[PDB]
Amino acid sequence: GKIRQGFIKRVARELFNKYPNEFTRDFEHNKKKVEELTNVTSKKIRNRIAGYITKLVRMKEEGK
Amino acid sequence: AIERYFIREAVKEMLIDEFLEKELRRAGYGGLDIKKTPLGTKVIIFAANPGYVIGRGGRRIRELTRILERQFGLENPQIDVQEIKNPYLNAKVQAVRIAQALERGIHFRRAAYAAMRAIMSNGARGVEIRISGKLTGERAKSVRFYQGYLAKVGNPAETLVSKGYAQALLKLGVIGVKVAIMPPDARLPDEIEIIE
Amino acid sequence: AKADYNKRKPRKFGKGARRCIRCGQYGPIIRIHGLMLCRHCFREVAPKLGFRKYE
Amino acid sequence: QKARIKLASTNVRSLEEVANQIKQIAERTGVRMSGPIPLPTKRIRIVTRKSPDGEGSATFDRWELRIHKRLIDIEADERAMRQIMRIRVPEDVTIEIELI
RNA sequence: UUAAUUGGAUUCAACGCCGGGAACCUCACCGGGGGCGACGGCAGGAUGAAGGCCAGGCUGAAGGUCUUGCCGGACGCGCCGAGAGGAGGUGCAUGGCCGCCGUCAGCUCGUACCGUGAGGCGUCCACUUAAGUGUGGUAACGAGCGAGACCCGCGCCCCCAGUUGCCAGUCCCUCCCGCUCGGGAGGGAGGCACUCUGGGGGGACUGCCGGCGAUAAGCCGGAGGAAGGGGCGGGCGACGGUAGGUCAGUAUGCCCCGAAACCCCCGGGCUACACGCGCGCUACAAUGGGCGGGACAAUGGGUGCCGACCCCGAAAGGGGGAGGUAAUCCCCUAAACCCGCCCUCAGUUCGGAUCGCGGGCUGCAACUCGCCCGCGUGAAGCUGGAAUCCCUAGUACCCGCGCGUCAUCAUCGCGC
Ligand SMILES: [Mg+2]
Numbered sequence: 059g060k061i062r063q064g065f066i067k068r069v070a071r072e073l074f075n076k077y078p079n080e081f082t083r084d085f086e087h088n089k090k091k092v093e094e095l096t097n098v099t100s101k102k103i104r105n106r107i108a109g110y111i112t113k114l115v116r117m118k119e120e121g122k
Numbered sequence: 123a124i125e126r127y128f129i130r131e132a133v134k135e136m137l138i139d140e141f142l143e144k145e146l147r148r149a150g151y152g153g154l155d156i157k158k159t160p161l162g163t164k165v166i167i168f169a170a171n172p173g174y175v176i177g178r179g180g181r182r183i184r185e186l187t188r189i190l191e192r193q194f195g196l197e198n199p200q201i202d203v204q205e206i207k208n209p210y211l212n213a214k215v216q217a218v219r220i221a222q223a224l225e226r227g228i229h230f231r232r233a234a235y236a237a238m239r240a241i242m243s244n245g246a247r248g249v250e251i252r253i254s255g256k257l258t259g260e261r262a263k264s265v266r267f268y269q270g271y272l273a274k275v276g277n278p279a280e281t282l283v284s285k286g287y288a289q290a291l292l293k294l295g296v297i298g299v300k301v302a303i304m305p306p307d308a309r310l311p312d313e314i315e316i317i318e
Numbered sequence: 319a320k321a322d323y324n325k326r327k328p329r330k331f332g333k334g335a336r337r338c339i340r341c342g343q344y345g346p347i348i349r350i351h352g353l354m355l356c357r358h359c360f361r362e363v364a365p366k367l368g369f370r371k372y373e
Numbered sequence: 374q375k376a377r378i379k380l381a382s383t384n385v386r387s388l389e390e391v392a393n394q395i396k397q398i399a400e401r402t403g404v405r406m407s408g409p410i411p412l413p414t415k416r417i418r419i420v421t422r423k424s425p426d427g428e429g430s431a432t433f434d435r436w437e438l439r440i441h442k443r444l445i446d447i448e449a450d451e452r453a454m455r456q457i458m459r460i461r462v463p464e465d466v467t468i469e470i471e472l473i
Numbered sequence: 474u475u476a477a478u479u480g481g482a483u484u485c486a487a488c489g490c491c492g493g494g495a496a497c498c499u500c501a502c503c504g505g506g507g508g509c510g511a512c513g514g515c516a517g518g519a520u521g522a523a524g525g526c527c528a529g530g531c532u533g534a535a536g537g538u539c540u541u542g543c544c545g546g547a548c549g550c551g552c553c554g555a556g557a558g559g560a561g562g563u564g565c566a567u568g569g570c571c572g573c574c575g576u577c578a579g580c581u582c583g584u585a586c587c588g589u590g591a592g593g594c595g596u597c598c599a600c601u602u603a604a605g606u607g608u609g610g611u612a613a614c615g616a617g618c619g620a621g622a623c624c625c626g627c628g629c630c631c632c633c634a635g636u637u638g639c640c641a642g643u644c645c646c647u648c649c650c651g652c653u654c655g656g657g658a659g660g661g662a663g664g665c666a667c668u669c670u671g672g673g674g675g676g677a678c679u680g681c682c683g684g685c686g687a688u689a690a691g692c693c694g695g696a697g698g699a700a701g702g703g704g705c706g707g708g709c710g711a712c713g714g715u716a717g718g719u720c721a722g723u724a725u726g727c728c729c730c731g732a733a734a735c736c737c738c739c740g741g742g743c744u745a746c747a748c749g750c751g752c753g754c755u756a757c758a759a760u761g762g763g764c765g766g767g768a769c770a771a772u773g774g775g776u777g778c779c780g781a782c783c784c785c786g787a788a789a790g791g792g793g794g795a796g797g798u799a800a801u802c803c804c805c806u807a808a809a810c811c812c813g814c815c816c817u818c819a820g821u822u823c824g825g826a827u828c829g830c831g832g833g834c835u836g837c838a839a840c841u842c843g844c845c846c847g848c849g850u851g852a853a854g855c856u857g858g859a860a861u862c863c864c865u866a867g868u869a870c871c872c873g874c875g876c877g878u879c880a881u882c883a884u885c886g887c888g889c
Pocket residue numbers: 494885
């Protein structure tokens with residue numbers, strides 16, 4: 059099953075609140091921003107975080 | 123060919139290290155290093171009691187050099203003795219110390235707690251100690267002491283944690299001691315930091 | 319002479335011509351690339367020699 | 374009038390450091406050097422039974438040792454030859470030089 | 474059964490297992506022959522201890538012992554303690570390691586609260602997941618180890634690198650064909666295009682679209698894509714239990730032998746054979762057998778070694794011997810497959826067990842007890858009762874090859 063991991067969600071929520079006006083609904087832009095704003099080194103973890111952040115943006119923009 | 127050269131050197135170090143570990147037990151032996159120079163071989167030995175290694179003004183260093191050159195294949199050896207860098211972060215040293223403490227006659231709980239307290243005081247993320255043998259009776263038993271953070275399964279546990287093992291020879295038989303320590307600078311894969 | 323009744327013949331082939339350099343056992347000796355070690359002794363000293371279990 | 378240098382080590386990083394040092398030595402002088410050629414890696418693989426006795430299911434260990442290699446060709450210039458003759462390699466790298 | 478046929482393991486989890494393919498050795502068994510007591514002391518000892526030898530008997534053979542006399546100079550098992558050594562007992566005295574429950578989802582802690590107490594709660598309920606994996610509700614609120622994350626390899630693209638790897642385009646020389654308009658093959662220059670080798674990087678995230686579910690966690694179906702939902706294959710096995718196996722790999726307590734249960738040498742045995750069982754190989758034929766001819770690999774290994782190339786021999790083999798410490802030289806022009814001819818449903822041109830004669834190789838030694846070759850001989854077997862095993866994709870079936878063991882020997886293990 060594709061169950062998101064706990065620390066991925068935690069760090070994604072932390073990043074979203076710190077810089078709300080920094081991420082869009084585009085995967086590439088979020089990927090670059092996550093790369094620059096943290097010390098993550100695994101290319102897989104970066105993609106997971108960027109995907110969850112994209113979902114968060116599109117969800118809050120809709121207003122839940 | 124070339125492979126035979128690499129393997130030949132690796133065996134010499136293993137044999138020498140085992141011999142020294144068995145020989146310099148009371149001096150707190152903590153590893154060695156071998157360097158090759160055009161004049162010969164520089165052999166550095168790490169220990170906690172360099173006086174025991176030197177042995178009252180030589181008479182022991184000369185014997186060690188002679189043994190190394192004759193019994194083993196070292197050419198023109200030269201032995202230097204130094205001090206262990208981080209004695210409380212080396213699992214082998216702590217295991218041997220606990221074994222010696224047991225051989226003296228201390229109850230194993232006191233020895234284990236003293237060792238854990240010292241190691242955690244010197245700034246280690248986690249430690250685990252396991253003692254097995256005929257403790258308090260003729261039916262064997264195993265006990266485990268633990269505190270802190272410690273990885274056990276996976277690649278990080280292979281490359282970050284330091285492990286050591288030792289035997290304690292008492293009157294009734296042998297007692298096995300295992301020690302595992304995690305250094306303060308170890309970082310797990312899921313420890314990510316936000317750049318401010 | 320009396321000491322001649324204790325020396326062994328210097329064999330050059332067969333199971334009796336090779337012993338583990340660490341424990342002295344005959345039999346399962348690994349002869350690859352010049353190693354002379356038992357299958358028992360090689361397992362517990364392999365990491366020191368630089369071998370690893372990648373897969 | 375050309376020298377051939379062979380490098381081999383069990384650690385890739387040290388090999389890269391030595392190769393980069395030789396490359397920079399050649400760069401700081403007027404001398405042509407064919408790039409470091411990567412030769413195939415040596416793998417030494419040993420498979421052993423795990424248990425000391427013969428009881429139970431049979432399981433095996435697969436130990437592996439890897440040896441990396443590089444090749445570098447450079448023309449014999451005494452001004453540049455002395456520098457590479459004095460560079461110090463780590464103890465886990467083997468170097469051999471010959472003139473062709 | 475025997476002089477001995479050494480020992481361990483008996484459901485899964487004993488029985489091509491102990492890396493166990495034992496001619497000597499290995500060796501632990503059987504027959505026989507020799508040798509060994511640091512260190513203390515007791516008899517003894519230069520008027521020479523302890524020790525060693527030419528020839529010849531005993532002997533399987535032996536200055537082992539004796540006969541016969543020649544050596545050497547300081548210790549002394551004839552005696553008492555003690556010791557080395559022990560594949561001798563105990564895995565139900567232990568350490569370390571390994572199998573199984575099980576790569577299953579479990580095992581706990583701080584404070585609070587409930588119960589007189591053993592204990593309980595969290596760890597429960599609904600949905601979901603490969604997972605105590607998650608989302609909501611909850612006298613619980615939060616943490617740790619395990620799972621995941623992590624490490625190695627495979628498949629797609631980009632940069633750098635060009636030898637010992639690669640040869641397409643361009644030039645030169647030589648030789649063949651349908652006589653050369655054209656088409657091939659070598660060699661030299663020359664190049665890094667392509668393949669390959671190995672460092673760095675990109676790429677996939679339920680990211681996009683439509684449904685179900687709660688609007689959450691997620692699930693189902695599509696687009697593009699080399700790759701789609703742990704992308705595929707491996708490594709890593711928590712707290713504990715199993716008095717599970719191992720003291721016959723090594724370490725080690727206790728008990729035993731301690732001039733034999735220690736150390737050497739020769740010859741036997743582990744290879745016996747009315748019989749029961751496990752795992753396999755070869756067949757019972759045409760979805761074939763034989764003969765001649767034609768095609769295409771990969772992994773690994775080599776100086777106590779791999780050996781191209783020439784000569785001799787019908788074969789197995791024999792005599793010289795370049796190159797190779799190896800991307801350079803060698804092992805190394807696989808088989809199943811394809812084409813033509815003979816056999817035509819038969820115990821046969823199926824099957825090749827068993828035995829006779831002869832020729833070889835390794836080795837100090839081939840009878841017990843090794844492997845190879847030529848001619849001859851030609852057993853059971855014509856598809857298998859009740860039962861029962863393995864396997865979901867480059868997988869299963871079929872076909873060969875490499876390495877380990879190894880002087881010689883592979884119906885085996887691990888890989889291709
Ligand atoms: Mg076998």
